[PDB]
Amino acid sequence: VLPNPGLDARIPSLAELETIEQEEASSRPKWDNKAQYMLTCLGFCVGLGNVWRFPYLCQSHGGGAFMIPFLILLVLEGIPLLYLEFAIGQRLRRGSLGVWSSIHPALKGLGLASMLTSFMVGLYYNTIISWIMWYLFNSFQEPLPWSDCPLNENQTGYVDECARSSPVDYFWYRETLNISTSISDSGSIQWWMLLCLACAWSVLYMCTIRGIETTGKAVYITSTLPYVVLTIFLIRGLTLKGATNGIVFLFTPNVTELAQPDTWLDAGAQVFFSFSLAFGGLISFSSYNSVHNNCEKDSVIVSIINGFTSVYVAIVVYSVIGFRATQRYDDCFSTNILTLINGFDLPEGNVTQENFVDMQQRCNASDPAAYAQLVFQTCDINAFLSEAVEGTGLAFIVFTEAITKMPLSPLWSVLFFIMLFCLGLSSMFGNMEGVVVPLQDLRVIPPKWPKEVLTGLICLGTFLIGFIFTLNSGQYWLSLLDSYAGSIPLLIIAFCEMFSVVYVYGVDRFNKDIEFMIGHKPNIFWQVTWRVVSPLLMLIIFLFFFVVEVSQELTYSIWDPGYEEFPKSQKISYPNWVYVVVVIVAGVPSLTIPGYAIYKLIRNH
């Protein structure tokens, strides 16, 4: 292992912890009961990550080809990092900077990266939630606004944009977003999104006014309501038409898709984005426990609950998607039968699904001319399931379209969107703690101020920066920033974290500390996965990222209402300047880890 001279005399040496435990109680906060701690760690690890990213990350990679590597990596890459994070956060009695600034101080920069990432996701997340808030307010009216098209000035024909496409797509792209035609077309600020953004940030600031001791009172509801609303929705979904016909599309993998580096890279990124690893949240939330709190139990419990929750959410979402696909296929076939019977004037109840081809053949062989001039639609089941859903366009395009087809639609809509909003707050609690704690650790503010002013300043700054996603071109910026803000850092930070813990602090000190804490040295599985397999898998993922990044064109989708073949969104290439923004969103939070270190290698020379 690396030398790191002087690691001792900067760390408690297990002879004081039994007494230091009863010493920080006066100034450092502590949990009310273990239920609050476990429930907060659970709520931090579930929400708006397996409802939005997992669906189209399954779709774009063939549905079932994304679920095998995801589980292999959740077993071999997630659990040991959860355990490592909990253990060091509990043993070192420090936040997200302390546990890395106290191990070869030239690693302090790594901590900064975490903080910076916990900011780059903030601006992202509280935009999504804002949209949800909007969709939550537009309920409470029986003729739901996304159920029918509006009429133009001449109140006899529909608006052409809503006529050539669905009314839900119109309400999403024109009445809510008012999206433009390119990323180079920015417009007004669109007041009717500022209200929702301000409401989202005000609620978030209300819940985290004091960190722990105030979020620990809201978590009881916030991390519990989803597991009831989701069970209700699962029961409602598994009894539709396309259910058990759209679930199989999720569990029929194709062995030709597993050999692409893209799928494995996306699986790694998703298993690091599901568990909030390398975010600096858990390493700090676990730093409030007593020194004798069993750690394997909580790590294993959180991992299992999170994995099975992800599987249940995927099942529900693909149930609804299968229902939608079966509906559209039935529409195809009904329209084709209607055209056929309108052509030759056949009896109404004679042409059906079973004997369609026979009647088609007869009507051709009878009168070739009149039959040839007809127009047919060619469309089959298990082919509308492959309709790729764009980013952030699943929870608003398919679920509203399926909710508008059920009895008592307003109740279902209110329940669904309050569930999503609760998941959002459940995640933003930790995503805010991860920025609040390091800033206090940096002595940026004088101690004379209360914490309320610092939290308010952070919320105000992030709200003022979040204007960019309220322009006419908001969704494009959002997708651009999301394609890169959560892929490279959540790999590099995690790898540096595990390498630091194992091969700098020394794994033997770690084993002795675990023995002193819980009562036995970890099982052989933990050591075999710490010292051998996990660094190799993370290095392979890190390399595959660069293998798949270069040699593929960057393209994004646009709406273009004035473009022929309109119902399908178009693809175009990013302008040349945008490679600046990526370097500022994916380079700086990742390049800070070596950079700061270099500074020390020059400062202490």
Binding site: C199, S202, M206, I209, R210, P450, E452
Partner: peptide, 19 residues
């Protein structure tokens, strides 16, 4: 909006109180 700002003011004043 009203009720949530009410919660904000009550909480922050609850502070000065118990402070």
């Amino acid at each position: 909006m009203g009720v949530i700002v009410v919660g904000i003011v009550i909480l922050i004043f609850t502070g000065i109180r118990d402070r």
